[PDB]
Design a protein around this nucleic acid. Structure first.
Ligand SMILES: [Mg+2]
Ligand SMILES: [Mg+2]
Ligand SMILES: [Mg+2]
Ligand SMILES: [Mg+2]
Ligand SMILES: [Mg+2]
Ligand SMILES: [Mg+2]
Ligand SMILES: [Mg+2]
Ligand SMILES: [Mg+2]
Ligand SMILES: [Mg+2]
Ligand SMILES: [Mg+2]
Ligand SMILES: [Mg+2]
Ligand SMILES: [Mg+2]
Ligand SMILES: [Mg+2]
Ligand SMILES: [Mg+2]
Ligand SMILES: [Mg+2]
Ligand SMILES: [Mg+2]
Lengths: 257, 121, 213
RNA sequence: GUAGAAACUGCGAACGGCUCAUUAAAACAGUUAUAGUCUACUUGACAUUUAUAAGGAUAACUACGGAAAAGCUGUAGCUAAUACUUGCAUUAUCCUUGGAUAAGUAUUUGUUAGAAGGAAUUAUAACAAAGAAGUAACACGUAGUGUGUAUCAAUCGAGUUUCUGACCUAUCAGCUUUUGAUGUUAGGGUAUUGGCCUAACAUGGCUAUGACGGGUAACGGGGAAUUAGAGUUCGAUUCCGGAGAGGGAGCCUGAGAAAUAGCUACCACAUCUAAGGAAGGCAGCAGGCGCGUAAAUUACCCAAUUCUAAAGAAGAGAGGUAGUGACAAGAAAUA
């Protein structure tokens, strides 16, 4: 036969899900949708392992049968739906609102935003297409098509999107002084600004970022997400504000009882 | 008779219709206050008029003796118990009593039924 | 050797048993689908004409129309063919089947009636049986009862002997393709949705053309 | 209005589980390309040349049957559909009415113009010829959903592909090319590139830095044992990749197979028979024979981990639980 695989084994699941190596040979195996498997979590993980509202898988099912969970203002009943980075989650029965973010480690957390902040999100552009009749469509990291994009929006910058109507509110550029969150290896939740851009011709582009403690790190261009202009961020942040300390200082701080 | 209950990591779950919590029971120099007594104390502790909305499971007695750990579960009413509790728990509580035990010999019936044709099988 | 005669007009059939070489002589070496007189099978069959429709041999293998031999052959069958039903989709199987020429090696005939003779052969030309099930598509009902548009169709569906639960109720089949307000609601809703999409597209186009400044 | 044996229709059965026979620049590992391609379910955008509602025909079923036997089926009479088919009504753009009409989504051929990538025969636009397939004759009672549908984008994947990296043997020194070996031109074929294949043409391609052969009680890797530091030896076997279903070769359906609890034939082995014929594949789970120095129960359950479906509610020897068990590992009586 040799077709598409349908099962996922536990020790082969992405490590940032933090699954018990005992109790089971399998993992939920997220469905196909707006996010990649390795850059997302299935809804069962969020709703049982993190929030602890459910005890088993079937309890997640009984929760989702009654239409009380919404992602991006739409109800979802799929137990393996992918959730992903900047999405908002609303639970009517508890009247709660969350936004997923990376912490200073490489793992996802629900951030518990307020009701007013629950009406938008930030999307970063991946490419811009020109189609019949000369209209321009932007494709976001969210796997989303936005027609009639403003002519000044380019490939790597981010945009702010209303959720009741799929319209654009404003857009944020990708420059030397913009504020950034990094989303891949060796620095997955750090927030810094930007120092320089390299532009190697045939290969990857490297950019450098400076912390608010004057610490500097670098990464690839493809795992850089703009979250604000020079001064302030446009969303609330988790408690560390993306400041990563080394292990000696972290151990010293933790030793306060 | 003489025991103390300490309820830990208490949490309310409006998505389901229950409260869920951990438990620890201190009974020095005696052994294993019964599950029936714990329900009655919890009903008083939580003003639970009735008693048939409480579910307890996973009790261990902690080598050495004198203390026990477990889990507990308190429901909004009886209808919420039957809606979303499994059948095996619902039998231990006595709410239902069904033991249809036809066995795994339905595989025999399944196999010798597909070889017969539309009308008779 | 065993004959099954069926009357298609009156929906009735009758079988007779024959152990004789003399009586079956006219039938031999005839293909299936061609007429043959029935005088020799009985003096009361004088003036009767039959047609051959099938049969099967001593071992029980059926006959098929295409093959022009007098004995058994071995073919591989597909979905559209006659003496085969697949277990999977796209499955094809090789089976053994009998030719379409009549011979002594048969065990059944399966022939039908065309013409009456001089007698009446009771049980084959006297009785008649109905459809056993009435139509369900509405246009079929109105074409059956030769109605016009104004005539409501719901009042002419018939159960034959139905008095099942009440004293006399005649529970009737549900009929499809009836004109209901629902249908109408579907049409008006679809038209409204189309117009709304048109208006929204015009709005968006005008707005974007404004923004290009 | 509620329930519903049979049956048609839809989706899955290409995932899972097992084993290590083949295999020495092959497979595999780290690094690349697809500007040379295909892609079901799921997610987002969103459409073009009788209508108060069209057609005929078939299961299940009834009656008459055949055969020792099989998941065998003949003739006659009925009847549905989101099965199989036909087809209605509608505006948009350029110059505060009219005119030209646009009359065609993908795809193919000819002539041109030209926001992005390092690089375009690129998005895209015009002119002249062809042109698939579609835009609801469907169901629920929640403005809301379910099912279906042209093209683009995303997602779950695959096919090819760049560079570098293996054990012993020279009592294996020259090899390949008539019959594709190495290149060029034009075609055919494929989802695409390619001697992948055909025709014409040229004489090339590899090699002591070990070609071409022989051997392996050789599947590769993540890893394991022992070691002060160097090293030497192992890796059938929890995860990833590859290959196979007694041995070979063909094929249908399908988004996906050269599938084997799918089909066709030969070789070997083997089952029932009224002697005409019919039906096979434990390297899946238990279990038996044989082989040998060498290895366990013809048990219970879907409660947990997950998967499939018309997706709370069914099923799963996947999986879990016990039974056997001085392989290996830890604690620890005989005062
Ligand atoms: Mg295979
Ligand atoms: Mg569970
Ligand atoms: Mg497999
Ligand atoms: Mg040639
Ligand atoms: Mg190995
Ligand atoms: Mg071996
Ligand atoms: Mg094994
Ligand atoms: Mg494997
Ligand atoms: Mg074998
Ligand atoms: Mg095969
Ligand atoms: Mg088998
Ligand atoms: Mg075979
Ligand atoms: Mg076995
Ligand atoms: Mg042993
Ligand atoms: Mg349903
Ligand atoms: Mg049940």
């Amino acid at each position: 036969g040799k077709g598409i695989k349908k099962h996922l084994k536990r020790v082969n699941a992405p490590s940032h899900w933090m699954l018990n190596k005992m109790g089971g040979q399998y993992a939920p195996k997220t469905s196909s949708g707006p996010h990649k498997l390795l850059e997302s979590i299935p809804l069962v993980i969020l709703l049982r392992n993190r929030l602890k509202y459910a005890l088993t898988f079937d309890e997640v099912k009984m929760i989702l049968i009654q239409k009380i969970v919404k992602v991006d203002n739409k109800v979802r009943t799929d137990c393996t739906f992918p959730v992903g980075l900047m999405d908002v989650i609303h639970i009517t029965k508890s009247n709660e609102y969350f936004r997923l973010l990376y912490d200073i480690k490489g793992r996802f957390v629900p951030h518990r935003i307020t009701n007013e902040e629950s009406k938008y999100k930030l999307c970063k552009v991946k490419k811009i297409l020109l189609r019949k009749g000369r209209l321009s469509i932007a494709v976001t990291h969210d796997g989303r098509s936005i027609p009639y994009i403003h002519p000044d929006v380019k490939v790597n910058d981010t945009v702010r999107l209303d959720l009741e109507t799929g319209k654009v509110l404003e857009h944020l550029k990708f420059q030397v002084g913009s504020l950034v969150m990094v989303t891949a290896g060796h620095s997955v939740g750090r927030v810094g600004v930007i120092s320089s851009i390299d532009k190697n011709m045939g290969t990857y582009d490297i950019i450098h970022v400076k912390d608010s403690r004057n610490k500097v790190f670098a990464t690839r261009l493809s795992n850089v997400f703009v979250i604000g202009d020079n001064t302030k961020p446009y969303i609330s942040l988790p408690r560390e504000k993306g400041i990563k300390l080394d292990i000696i200082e972290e151990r010293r701080n933790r030793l306060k009882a | 008779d003489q025991f103390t209950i300490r309820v830990k990591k208490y949490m309310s779950n409006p998505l389901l219709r229950r409260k869920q919590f951990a438990l620890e029971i201190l009974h020095p120099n005696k052994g294993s206050v019964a599950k029936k007594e714990v329900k009655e104390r919890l009903a008083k502790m939580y003003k639970l008029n009735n008693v048939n909305t409480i579910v307890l499971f996973g009790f261990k007695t902690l080598f050495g003796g004198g203390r026990t750990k477990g889990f507990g579960l308190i429901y909004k009413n009886v209808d919420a118990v039957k809606k979303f509790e499994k059948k095996y728990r619902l039998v231990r509580e006595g709410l239902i009593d069904k033991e249809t035990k036809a066995g795994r010999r339905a595989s025999k019936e399944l196999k010798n039924r597909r070889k017969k044709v539309r009308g008779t099988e | 050797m065993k004959l099954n005669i069926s009357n298609p007009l009156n929906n009735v059939q009758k079988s007779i048993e024959i152990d004789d070489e003399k009586k079956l002589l006219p039938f031999m070496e005839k293909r299936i689908g061609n007429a043959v007189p029935g005088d020799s099978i009985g003096e009361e069959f004088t003036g009767y004409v039959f047609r051959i429709t099938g049969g099967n041999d001593k071992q029980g293998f059926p006959m098929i129309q295409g093959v022009l031999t007098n004995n058994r052959v071995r073919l591989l069958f597909k979905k559209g063919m006659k003496c085969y039903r697949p277990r999977k989709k796209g499955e094809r199987k090789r089976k053994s089947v009998r030719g379409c020429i009549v011979g002594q090696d048969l065990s059944a005939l399966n022939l039908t009636l065309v013409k009456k003779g001089v007698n009446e052969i009771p049980g084959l030309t006297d009785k008649a049986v109905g459809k056993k099930l009435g139509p369900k598509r509405a246009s079929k009902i109105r074409k059956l009862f030769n109605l016009d548009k104004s005539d409501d169709v719901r009042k002419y569906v018939i159960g034959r002997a139905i008095t099942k639960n009440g004293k006399t109720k005649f529970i009737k089949p549900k009929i499809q393709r009836l004109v209901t307000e629902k249908r109408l609601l579907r049409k008006r809703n679809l038209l409204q949705a189309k117009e709304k999409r048109r208006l929204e597209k015009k709005q968006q186009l005008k707005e974007y053309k404004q923004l290009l400044n």
